[PDB]
Amino acid sequence: DLDLAKASATDQLKKAKAEAQVIIEQANKRRSQILDEAKAEAEQERTKIVAQ
């Protein structure tokens, strides 16, 4: 039980690094979506003020 505790502990850190990078990646995806959407929608403001 000492040995299998040794193993199943580091199991959790192996899991934890994956679930860290997954949420970081999702943060970056939401970042790029925020930026691209704000850019695409501000371009409408530019074009309308100019055409006006």
Binding site: E45, R46, I49, V50
Partner: protein, 52 residues
């Protein structure tokens, strides 16, 4: 977008000035060709010979 409007103002203004300038010279030319008579020609030449 604001700079892109300032540029268009400047450019339309310039075009509108260009037209009037070339009409000013064309008109002055037609008037001149219509108004000259021998006393005026002599008035011009007799002056230029004095500063000659």
């Amino acid at each position: 977008a604001q700079a892109e409007i300032e540029a268009e103002r400047k450019r339309a203004r310039e075009e509108l000035r260009k037209q009037v300038a070339i009409l000013a010279v064309a008109g002055a030319e037609k008037i001149i060709e219509r108004s000259v008579d021998e006393a005026a020609n002599s008035d011009i030449v007799d002056k230029l010979v004095a500063e000659l």
